[PDB]
Structures are given as C-alpha cells and as structure tokens.
Subunit: 354 residues, 4 copies
C-alpha cells in the first residue's frame, strides 16, 4: 500500500495572511471572471464564467429556475441528470429559450445569441441517448456526475463524445482527489475536472464510504498536478472545487488554492429558486436538501435527507458573499482570481485554536 507524509485537511483549517493592498483595490474593481473549459497556453477559454460559482448537479438544487437566476448573476447551473432524458432536456431548452416572446405551442452569462448559458449532468450509462438530446436542447456544457471519476467508464464516455462531436461539445469529468485521478481524466480529454469526494455537507449526516480526502488537500494536490500538466503539454485544464464550502471565506480559500471555480449544493439549496418545497417548521422557513446518493434521489446504498434555512432570493445572497470574497482578495493584494492564486499566502491553523 501507498501512504502519505501529511494528513489531509479541510477548509476550516486554513486562513489567508494579508499581502500589500494597493489604493486601486476596492471590491468594485475586482474581476471575478474565470475559465470553465480547457484551452492552450496564450489562449482564452471559449467559456468564461463572470463569477466563479456553479450550482451542484442535484435534484434539490439545479432546476430550470436556479439555472436562470444563477446565469443572470454570471454563474452557471448544471441541470441534474438523475431524471429522464426527456425531462432534463426540457429544462435545458426552457433555460436556453427563456427570453423568447411569442412561442409556437450586467453580469448575465449568455451565449452569442444573448441566451443564458446552462450546463447539464450526464452519467456513464445512457450517454449515447442522453447526450444527443442535451446537445439538441442547447446545453452549453456537460459534466459527468460521479462519486469516483477515476474510472474507465468516464474515459469511454468522453471518448464517445469526442468521436461524435470532436471538441465542439464541452464535457467536464470527476470527481477525483489527487494528481493521478486528474491526470487520467486530463489524458481522457475532459474539458474541466471536478475535485472532491466525501467533503460535501451531505456527508455530515451519513457514514463514511471509506474513500475520500480533505477538500483543501485535494484541491492543493490536484492544482499542483494541473500546473505540472500545463507545463508539460501547454494545455490548461480548469478545475472545480466541489463541495465543502461552509462559510463565504471558504470560497476565497478554494480559489486561492488554485480552483478556477466552485460547485456548491447546500449554498444554493437555501434559495427561493431551488426546485424544492419551502416548508415552515415552528416559525422557521426551511428548504429541502438531499444527496444524490440517497434512495430518495436515485429511484427514477447511501442516503441523506435534511433541511436548510431559507435565505431568500439567490441574487442578494450571492452579491453579499462575493462582496466579502472581493474584499478579502483586496486584503491579499489581488484584483483577479489568477492574481490571487499567484499572490495568496495560506497558513494552516492549529486544531487547538479551532
């Protein structure tokens, strides 16, 4: 067996040490643009998010309304794939054609036709039928959804997409937690790679499957491999820190450690736009939230079902969260995510102080 020198850590175990803040760095001047899909050295990504936040590929998070609301603020949602091909394609189509008027019976993220961008999750099983349907519906990007992306099944899925669509259809893959996993999916052709196993808030109320790694350590390790890969091939593959974001400052940390964007479930589940029921229990307005591994999810094993405090509209909450991220970025002397990734000073905190 192979062992490691240091134990893995979570975001709660880190803090940022300030760098030189210039008179020109104020929250409003901070640019949160970030690449979504791979590109070559010197190029720009074909798809750039205006804010580094994407909603989780979950039934209780990314429905049509969430996708529209998030795209309006500059991010993108990945419509859940744990539903019928027809049902998921309908949501994608609804998002792509939302601005239409008569239909035959500032930071918005849109395509060349001013239509909101939207992503869609796929699986390694029915892709031969699901992918064409999502492509037809107008999906802007796809992502293989899995608890263990270090699999030949993902390579096969990406291969089929490349053979049928070449590099015209974008597809992310995951999840992985180390350089080996990243490298495998990179060579397989993934446009972006998702990082994270066992770090989601859903795991708080469930038992360990035995596989996983502290989210912070996973991002740091994968990012190092991604940078090495860039140096060897000239190909820059964006990576996504998926899960484990508990507080707003965790967002800044994930980005500082090298993640290009962040995927969140619980964070968005709390909003009015999530596709779940708003329930009031003893004066407390809550929203439903369950894992994709729960029996409640897959039936169209693991299992986690819970409630999250209602937070209102997505817009006001994201604005507040990102204002804090931008302010912290200025503390670190960064006006952009790439500058933050270059200048960030990250310290581990003692367990005693926690």
């Amino acid at each position: 067996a192979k062992y490691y020198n240091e134990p893995c850590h979570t975001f709660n175990e880190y803090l940022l040490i300030p760098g030189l803040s210039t008179v020109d760095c104020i929250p409003s001047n901070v640019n949160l643009s970030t690449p979504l899909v791979k590109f070559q050295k010197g190029q720009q990504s074909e798809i750039n998010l205006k804010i580094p936040l994407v909603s989780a590929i979950m039934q209780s998070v990314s429905g049509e309304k969430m996708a529209i609301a998030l795209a309006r603020e500059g991010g993108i949602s990945f419509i859940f794939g744990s539903q019928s091909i027809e049902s998921q394609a309908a949501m994608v189509h609804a998002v792509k054609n939302f601005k239409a008027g008569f239909v035959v019976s500032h930071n918005e993220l849109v395509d060349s036709q001013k239509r909101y961008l939207v992503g869609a999750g796929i699986n390694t099983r029915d892709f031969r039928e699901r992918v064409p349907a999502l492509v037809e519906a107008g999906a802007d990007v796809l992502c293989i959804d899995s608890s263990d992306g270090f699999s030949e099944w993902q390579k096969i899925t990406i291969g089929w997409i490349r053979e049928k669509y070449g590099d015209k259809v974008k597809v992310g893959a995951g999840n992985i937690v180390d350089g080996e996993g990243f490298r495998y999916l990179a060579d397989a052709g993934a446009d972006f790679i998702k990082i994270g196993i066992g770090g989601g808030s859903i795991c708080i109320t469930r038992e360990q499957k035995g596989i996983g790694r502290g989210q912070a350590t996973a991002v740091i390790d994968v990012v190092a491999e991604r940078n090495k890969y860039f140096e060897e091939t000239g190909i820059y593959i964006p990576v996504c820190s998926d899960g484990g974001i508990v507080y707003d400052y965790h967002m800044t940390l994930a980005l500082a450690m090298g993640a290009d964007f962040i995927m969140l479930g619980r964070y968005f589940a709390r909003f009015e736009e999530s596709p779940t029921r708003k329930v009031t229990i003893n004066g407390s307005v809550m929203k439903e939230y369950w894992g994709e591994g729960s029996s409640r999810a897959r039936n169209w094993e693991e299992g986690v079902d819970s409630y999250v405090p209602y937070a209102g509209k997505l817009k006001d909450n994201v604005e507040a969260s990102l204002n804090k991220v931008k302010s912290t970025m200025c503390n670190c002397g960064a006006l952009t995510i790439p500058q933050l990734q270059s200048k960030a000073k990250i310290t581990l905190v003692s367990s005693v102080s926690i």
Copy 2:
C-alpha cells in the same frame, strides 16, 4: 527506554484514495478469498477462507450456532476456550457433524468431507489436555487466546503441539502489536498471528491496562515485519487484525493495510446466532456482550459488560457489509485482497476534520 517517531493511530483516522476503476470491476466479480495459515513462496495456504471475517474467541460470540452460520457464508468461528474442555469439544463436534442425518445416540467453508470448518481457542495452561480433545472433536484450526502473545508460554504451547502433531495441527497465536512480537511468534512456529491490544470495543467502557497501540499502526507495523520475514525466509504468515472494527469501511482499511483476515466480536454479537440472550429494553431489542477479561467471563482484574443493538440474522448483515467492501475495492481498482494490498492508497485524516 525506547520511544517512537510517530504516535499510533486508529482506523477512524484513515481513508482510501481511489485508484483506476476498470470496466471489469463490479462487486460481484470481486474475490474475497484469503489465506488462514502459513505457506511457502509459490504455494497456496492449506486453508483459505471464502470471506476475510472470523468471529472472536469469546463466550458472548462464538458458540455452535455462530460457527455454523459464519461457515455457511465462507468465514470461520473460533469456539471460545473459556469453558470446560468437554464443553468446548462438544461444540466443535456439533459443528463438524451438523450435516449428519441419522445419528447414533455456494460460499460455504467446508473440509474435504463437506463438513463446515471450525476453529477453537486454547490457552497456555491446560493445552496438554485441551488440544488432544479438540483435535479428536475435529477442530480444523486452533488459536492461542491472550492479551499479550509476546510470551514464552506461547512458544512452549506451540512447541508442544509441533512435537506431538508436527505441522498437521494448525495453531494461530497472539496478540501482538509490533514487529518484535510478530517475529517471536513466527520463529516459534505460529501458523497465523493475531494483531491487537486495547483496540477492542470492549475497552470503550473500561480503563487502560497501560499496554497497547493504535490498531491501524499495529497492523501496518506488523505487516511490514511480516513482508520482511517473507523475503528473508520464503515463509508467508497470514496476520489477523483483531478488534477495533467500528464501521464497515474499517474492514476495507484493515485489509488494505495488509491484514489477511479480520477478527470481530461486537459485530457478530449483534446477530441472532450469537449465544447470548436477546433482551428487549424499552422497545429496543439488544443482545448481551462482555469481554473475556470481565469477572463474568473468567470464573469457570478487568471487566466490561454491555449491550449491542440487535441486527437480525448474520447472513443479511455480512452480505451488506461485504458488498460495501467490494464496492470500495473496485473504487481502488482491486478485484482481490492481494491486489488491494498492493494498490491501496491510504491517507491519514486530520483530527480537526474528525
């Protein structure tokens, strides 16, 4: 005094990092066969379990019914030796002759005569009389039961067995927690060595005797010594991780760290087949469970007596546990235990994340 560079750790402090999962690895194709007794390089063990689980040498765990139920699923039970020679021999005989019809007044683990295999615990005191009786009764393997197997008494016991039966009678020894202890029992002639002191769940409700070591560290250290021993002598001695299994994923970890099989007490005590009373307390069906060191056990000092939640039939529970182990093995890219031991990537987790 001799000190160590790193502190010892328990199973809860580890997680497995996924490896490449091939299209051919599905739970049903995973082989959990494993050697029980020592053999030379290139040989196969004379006794191979079909599943890597054996029940503890305890009054509250391994009785006749447990032995039959576990053997039926591919494992083996070690009938407790903390009872009269006559009483223990009777249980062994009952297991060996269970399939008999008229008696004169798929994954089953059996001998050449299709009789379920069964083991029996012995002590370093009355072995001259207990061993012959167990051999006559048909015991397939014996194991010296002790909290500290690094003892001349164990060497003497194994020696007497070798002098009387040669290598025709198999006998495990233990418990030890480091290379020195392993080496001593290996040179003494033990067929398999049990690892673990102070890691049993029984210790949760009792005070430390002062001796012990984190179960994970103990297995890792002993396994390293065992592999070194194999390289020097060509003799492969199976080792058993005894105690400390709290969750199913701990089983996968123990195996990944090098243990050939696992001994459990609490896990099996919960089943209908354990020899203890099923008691209902306030709507909760429980089963009794007490340590062999408790005054309640030895009287035919330490002391631990408690209850464990009823889990029903052994069969359904083991199937569920092993299905999870096999699934995790596929995440790690392993179709067998030896392949897992070779490919496993094991990371320590921070105390903060725990």
Copy 3:
C-alpha cells in the same frame, strides 16, 4: 500560492519553563518599563511606558476616564477615532489638562509638564483634518487603526504626517501578522507596529473574515523580522501584541515572545472607568463591549456586541495582574522585559493536555 511549514498557534498553546531565580528577584524589584516609539541603536525611546499595557482604540474602551486611570498606573490609552474629530480632540484635551485648577470657561505616565500622556487613533481617510486637531489638542502619540495595515493607504498617511511634522509627531501603524507586513510599515516610517488580526476576543462571537493568524505565531514571526530589521538598519521598532489576551499569564507570554507592549480591549472594558454602561442582569453586574467592526460602532459588514463581567476599578485589577506577571518573570530569572525576552524558555503544549 505560498504555504507554511507549521500551523499558527494561540497563547493558550504555550507555557514558560523556569530559569534560574536569583535572590535579588522579587516582584517589587521587577521593572516593567518599555519603549513605545522607535529609536536608534544605543538610544532610549523618547516615550517609555511604565507598564506594558495600553487600552484598545475602541468606543467601548478608551474614553477620557480610562485614559486618565491607565496613565495614572503607568500605561497609555489610545482615545478611539470612530467619532467626530471635534469629539475625539475634546477627550484628548480633557486628559492633557486634567490637573488644571482654575480654568477659563508614583508610576504615573506624564510628559515634561507633568500632564498625563494620551494617544489617539486615526484612520487613513480624514487624517489631513483629524491629525492637526489631535496635535493641537495635545495628543502625545497617534496610531492608525485598521484590520489590515499592510496597505498603501497607511504608507500615504504616515508620509503626509512626516511631510508636515517630520519625526516630531509619533504614529504607530497596523495591524499586520507577518514579517512582510512589518517590513512594509517599518520602511513607511511607523514609530511602532501593532500585531494581530482575528485574535481579539470579539471574534469569539462572529464568523471568520478569512484573514488572520494565531496571535502567538504572529508575534514570534514579526519579532524575528523586527530583530532582523534592527540588525540591518540599527533602528529598533517597538511592536505591540494586539488582542488575544485571555488570562494574565498570556501577558507574560506575549512579552517573552518579544512584544514590547500589549493592547487589550476586553480586559479594560470590565472596569468602572470604561465609557460604557454598567448593567445588572440577574444579580450580575456587567459592562457593554462591542467590536469596532460592528454596525453599532461604525455609523457616525462584521458585528459583535456582548457583555463582560464587572471587575471594579482599573487600579486594583492591573496591580494584581502585573504582580503575577512580575512573579512569573522572577521564575524565569528576569528583572526587566528585555531580560525576559532574552532568557525566556517557551514550550508549546499538546492539544491533548488542553
């Protein structure tokens, strides 16, 4: 990104190991004098506190009465700047002219005219108007108050002061937590540098902003840079450990680690002289205490409002605290703060023992 070899620690994680105590070291012979502003090798600071304690630049701590009471015991207060220029200048003037008799409508810290010394906090925004007013009022020293002093805004503020007053007006700067930050403010011209971000007791009831560092690690790191700076330039810049003092022995630790003086908020908020209301809740006399980042403070975001147990007069409490500090200093073989900083033996304690 830049990472660190060791995690940061708080004061609770340290203890002092005794050194040789001489017959001449008794609490009463211990000298707690300490420099407040920078000086060259071989010189004495133009301003020396008689005790190493200064009260925080907070609305709920440093008002006129606090400033008089603390100066009487040998320390100095920094009148809060989160109020109108006119209001703050009035408090400064009131302190400077407290001993006056007819006014036209042993360890005391005083100026050449026997007037109590007093400091005043300033900000990087209205200094062009606030500074002249404070200077006119008689402020003896100023200090830029900020959660992140590693800023060009602080350099600009110090620059303006130097251009207008040369080295005749003393001004501290902060806060910083590492050598880089210290170095920046040192080169900018600061007379003393304050250390500490996120370590204040106020943070106990609030969420992390994402920036910070264990107070002990921050002091140790900054002190090392300060000593290096002294060796390179011959300039000795006093540093202040700001926040995180929970127990009296933390004072001794901060000083032993190299801090010349200590800034405290909660400690002084408990006294009769703090400018907040004394409220009795269920038989418990308390005093109000809120952070400068709370909405309650700035309105003339973050937010922390709470109560601290009443402790009575500042005099008796400081005497008791310092008697303990002096006794511990004698345990360490030190009769002065500089001797303590040279002889102190500081050990980290295990999280288990905590």
Copy 4:
C-alpha cells in the same frame, strides 16, 4: 527567547508496547525496590524504598497516620512543612517512636532500629531553625518543597545543610522540569530531585500561573540529563515524578520513563489515613483535598479546594495498584524497575484516539 522542537505531553498520551514475557515473570516475583538518595557508580543507595510511592508534602495528605500506614507498605511520607516547626517535629517524632511500649510522659520500611522511616518537607526560609528540629525529631530524609526549585534559595538551603551536617543529612530539592533545572540542583548537592510543575490534579480546578510543562515530557527530559550527569560524574541522582498520576498505569509509565519513585497527593488523600475530615455528601463518602498554594493552606495567590472519593484503607488500595503495575511490568519483560527502565517500549498515542 528559546523555543522547542516538540510540544510537551502528559501521561495520558502514552502507552507501553509489550516485550518478551518470560515464564519466570509473575507479579509476585517482581521487585519494586528503588533508591531514594544519590550514590556513586557501583554503590547502593543508603535509603531504598520497598515500593516506589511517596505521599505528597501536603497538609491534606501527609500527617502522622499516613506516614505510618505508607511506611508499613514499604513507601515513605514527607510530613508537611506548612505548619509550625514544633508541630511538624512532633509528627516526625510520633512516627519514629510509634513502636514504643511504655513511654515516659513484611514490606515495612524501617531504619536499623526497626523504626518506620519518615521524611519531612522544609522551606527556603526558616530552615536554620526547622532543620535542626526535624533532625532531632529523627527525620530520615528532608525535601525542599517549592513550585520552582530552579532557585538560588534552594542552593543556599542545601549549602547550609551541608556545612552543618555534611552528607549525613539527606535532602531532596525541586521542583524542576528540564535538564537545566536538574543540573543546577544536582551541582547544588541535592540527594534527589523532584520533577513537575503544573501537572498536579489540583491544577484541574485553577488557572495556569504561566509556568510548567507536560509531566511526561518533563520526566523524559530530566531523566536524560540525569543519565548524562551520571556518565560525566559517576553520581546517580534519583529523580521523583511529582504529580499527574491519574490512573494506576500512569505509575508504570512514570517509572518506565526513568523516574525512580513517584510522589502523589490525590491518590493518598482518598484514604482513611489522610489527615482530613471524612465527609458524606448525598450518600457519597468523600475526603477533603486542597493545594498547598490555596489561601486555606498558607496562612499559618493561587487556591484550590475540593473533595475526592473515599477509597478506604491505604493498604488494600496500594496492593491493588501495585499488582497492576507488576503485571504490566511482566508484560514488558521486567522483574525490577531498573530492568523496566532499560527495556520499556513507549509509544505516544494520537489525540484522536483520546
């Protein structure tokens, strides 16, 4: 300031790993004799305890009855010195002349006249008068009682004793927690050195004074210095682990780490023979226990007053404790304390497993 590479640890953070147990090692054959005062290489100590336990120099622990009861079992008590010279001398005399019949108005520890041995605590202040009185009363050994023995006052006290009595009067000194402190008292002439600051159970209900060190680390460090000192001078100075013994196995650990004997307060306070009142609170028989630093103690600052569960007669409790120590010693392959100190394998345990 001077810092250390590793944090200090307590006894709870350690466990012993078994060594080879020989057929000749059974509890009854284990010899717990141990030296009390210094001797040269090749010699035997002039005073050897029959068991390695001594009672604390406390008002609530070591009175006349305790001294007699402990001496009867082979240990020695140090009559508290926090009382009048006349009062303390009376207790010493009472112990020395307990076996007398008409008075003019197996493992027992005795002198050449069959009189129970007894020690007495002294202070660095009134020794010129207290020492002669204790010597006259028949005290067999003295010990300077202090929270910080790294003091010129202790050197002066030992010096006065040597000048007046030469090496005919034995006197221990302490407390210290590192090699420097040990070395100072060794060169000063101490017959034995006590280790421990802040590790006593009394500290559980009180605030840190700021000085101290984990008890285990303190013993290990001092023992290393003591062994180095022995190699350089040929003088063997016994050391005493004072305080921090919570469980019986802590005794074995302290001895294994190199301490020759152990001083305990709480342990003995629970017995019928302690000089405090036996009080029954709600069906629970308790005994009083307070620190020597409490105002309740010195008045003939710190302060700790509490209750300990009644345990009955000293005899039965010590026998049980030592039976466990001896059994563990056999697990480690040791028949004597020196053999244990040579063969012991000591591992640190993870904070997670604790």
